[PDB]
């Protein structure tokens, strides 16, 4: 269960450089302790800065703009496998940017055994145009007048024994 | 890259012969050998040019270019099936004498 955070930080000011540039990252983290941790993890991948020599300036939750509008998201990924490092691009259907990232983490764990530590989220983009959708497993839900049943419904029973024959209509 | 260049040469020689002569009629065949086709052009040295190719390319490559040479337009609905071209201009009788000439038959 994740949240999207805006984390802003900078190098500690010096008498040589008293206003270092402020850098922001969008972090998908369960809480603010990991959000600031992930921020320093990526800044030391890009900038000559450390947690000891830096300073967190702001941490803010970024809420979904239209949390009850159904969207299609494209997520650009960089993950590590058992053998090498790979770039990937995948698509997810959800109403929140966070819920698409949560689906992504479940998805790469299941099909690629990629743990949370092995994944870099390069970019999350809401696909405005139907032509922007490249993947068929999410493009099949953008067809006109989509209907489908749910055959073979299994009902969960509170009791151990049922006195009537089971059914699966629905 | 080669096909598009060879496509370019085909539409090139297509419009080259189109203006240089004029008027053509129905010219479709079937079960015609390669030596069969060599026979007609062997005697049709200059009096006619056996323009050859296919269907789908010829239609649109002329249909889109119905601007520098419009006129045709509704003429395109004629081109169906195995159809060649014998680029020439003489008369209704004078071409069928030299063209219909060779026939190869079978039961």
């Amino acid at each position: 269960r994740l949240n999207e955070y805006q984390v802003i930080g900078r190098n500690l000011p010096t008498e040589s450089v008293p206003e270092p540039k402020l850098f922001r990252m969008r972090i998908f983290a369960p809480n603010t302790v990991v959000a600031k941790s992930r921020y320093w993890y990526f800044l030391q991948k890009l900038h000559k800065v450390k947690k000891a020599s830096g300073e967190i300036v702001s941490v803010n939750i970024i809420s979904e703009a239209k949390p009850t509008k159904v969207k299609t998201f494209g997520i650009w990924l960089r993950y590590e496998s058992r053998s090498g490092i790979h770039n990937m691009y995948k698509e997810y259907r959800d109403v929140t940017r966070v819920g698409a990232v949560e689906t992504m983490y479940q998805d790469l764990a299941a099909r690629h055994r990629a743990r949370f530590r092995s994944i870099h989220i390069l970019k999350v983009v809401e696909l405005e145009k139907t032509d922007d959708v490249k993947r068929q497993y999410v493009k099949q839900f953008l067809t006109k007048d989509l209907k489908f049943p749910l055959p073979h419904r299994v009902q969960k029973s509170k009791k151990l024994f049922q006195a009537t024959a089971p059914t699966t209509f629905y | 890259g080669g096909a598009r260049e060879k496509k370019v040469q085909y539409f090139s020689k297509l419009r080259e012969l189109l203006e240089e002569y004029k008027s053509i009629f129905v010219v479709g065949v079937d079960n015609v050998s390669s030596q069969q086709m060599h026979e007609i052009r062997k005697a049709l040295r200059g009096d006619a040019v056996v323009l050859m190719g296919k269907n789908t390319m010829v239609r649109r490559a002329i249909r889109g270019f119905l601007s520098e040479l419009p006129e045709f337009e509704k003429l395109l609905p004629f081109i169906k099936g195995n159809v060649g071209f014998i680029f020439t201009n003489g008369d209704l009788k004078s071409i069928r004498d030299i063209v219909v000439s060779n026939v190869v038959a079978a039961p």
């Binding site: 068929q136 497993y137 099949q140 989509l146 489908f148 049943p149 055959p151 | -």
Partner: protein, 190 residues
Amino acid sequence: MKYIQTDQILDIPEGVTVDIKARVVKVTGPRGELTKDLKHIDVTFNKINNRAIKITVHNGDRKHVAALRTVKSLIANLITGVTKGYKYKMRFVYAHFPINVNIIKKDGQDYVEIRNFLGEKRVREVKIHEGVTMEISSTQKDELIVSGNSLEAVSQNAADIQQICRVRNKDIRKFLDGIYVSERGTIVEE
């Protein structure tokens, strides 16, 4: 990928009445009726009209989608079996020993009796499946005609006849003797 829905359209000719209830297809035509149970597949049927039937798989994976056009083809074979029939022609292939083939009836059962195959003293008997008709072709020397409404039974009886005549302990590239299916067509020529 779990394709959301996949469809196939059966086509029913004018004189044929398909009839489906609980995945039990009963096809009726001028030549008769054929029935088939499809309870081993998860498919659903919709009657588009009297001449077309939609066959649908909902939320099916790759193999379960693969099982859809086979349902279509089986029902189509049923339809053409009750409107055109099926006919397999077999040619008797031998280099030296003539194959003596008779249509015998023992114990109330029809059998195809093959004798002298590669000179063997053994007498081969193949049971003729129900609904399958045997005939010794008059227009062709060493030809057997296997005909019937069900393609599956006809082809399987033909295969039985072909399989009982396999060559052992020889170079089968050299010893090409046997009974082979030469023509797979229909009773009504098209």
